[PDB]
Structure formats: C-alpha cells, structure tokens
Ligand binder design. Structure first.
Ligand code: 3D1
Ligand code: THM
Length: 95
DNA sequence: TGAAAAGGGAATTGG
DNA sequence: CCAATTCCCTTTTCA
C-alpha cells in the first residue's frame, strides 16, 4: 500500500487553475501556459509546498527551483528567459 | 555591494 | 528506483 503524493508541476498547476496563492504565482500569458513567481512572496508558496509533501526540512524556493530544473529532462515545465518565469507544456492546458 | 537570480553535481530518501 | 530533497558550488545581474 504505497501512498500517492503530488508532483511539483501538479501542485503549481493546481494553484494557478484555482487562483490560490495569487500573490505568490500568477499566469503571465495563460493561453501560452506561461507563469511567474513573486519576487517577494515566493518563499511562502515554497513553504506551502514543503508542508504539502510533509518533508522533514523547511522548503525554500531555491530547493523548489532546483527541483523544477529537472523537468527539462521530461518536459512538463521549462524555464523561460524571464525573471522567475516558467512555462507548462501545452499538453497540460485546455484546447 | 550583497541579495537575488540563474545555473550546476551529487548523495540522499520516502514511498 | 522514481521524484524530488538537501546540500553545496558557481557566475551574472542590478537594486
Ligand atoms: O562600496 C561601493 C559599492 C557600493 N555600491 C552600491 N551600489 C553601487 C552601484 N550601483 N555601483 C557601484 N557601487 C555601488 O557603494 C560603493 C560605491 O559607491
Ligand atoms: O532497480 C533496482 C532498484 C529497485 N528498488 C529497490 C529498492 C530498495 C526499493 O525499495 N524499490 C525499488 O524499486 O529494485 C532494483 C534492485 O535493487
């Protein structure tokens, strides 16, 4: 009996779709899947991610961005050439 | 002028 | 052994 936990891209996509923590992350170009983190309030979302996963240490945005870097391999999220800006693969977005 | 932002290697670990 | 987590290292920017 192995318990399921959220993946980072799901956590973030759920935040965006529901308009939660809109002070910490927001759509920049929603039709294109492009979103961006708040420069001042991103660590609050980071801590919320750590709690969500029940990790032993406090989650910081450095460790969160470090995690996002690995998605370059599988392609669910890529970094965009804009400050604290990222992009979801379009197969995660409606038509 | 140092915090922030951007990369990175790799050992680790819950499940 | 995935899917991050954790820790540490770098360079570049600019507020
Ligand atoms: O101690 C040096 C460096 C520091 N300082 C702060 N902001 C600076 C900019 N924009 N250019 C150069 N030096 C900067 O103050 C002293 C120089 O005035
Ligand atoms: O492919 C490897 C790793 C895999 N493995 C090992 C262990 C200890 C575990 O808990 N899960 C798991 O999938 O088994 C193969 C042999 O070690």
């Amino acid at each position: 009996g192995a318990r399921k936990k959220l993946r980072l891209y799901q956590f973030l996509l759920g935040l965006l779709l529901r308009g939660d923590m809109r002070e910490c992350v927001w759509w920049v170009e929603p039709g294109a899947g492009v979103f961006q983190f708040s420069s001042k309030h991103k660590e609050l979302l980071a801590r919320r991610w750590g709690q969500q996963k029940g990790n032993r240490k406090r989650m910081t945005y450095q460790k969160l961005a470090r995690a996002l870097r690995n998605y370059a391999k599988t392609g669910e999220i890529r970094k965009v050439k804009r400050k604290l800006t990222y992009q979801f693969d379009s197969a995660l977005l409606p038509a």
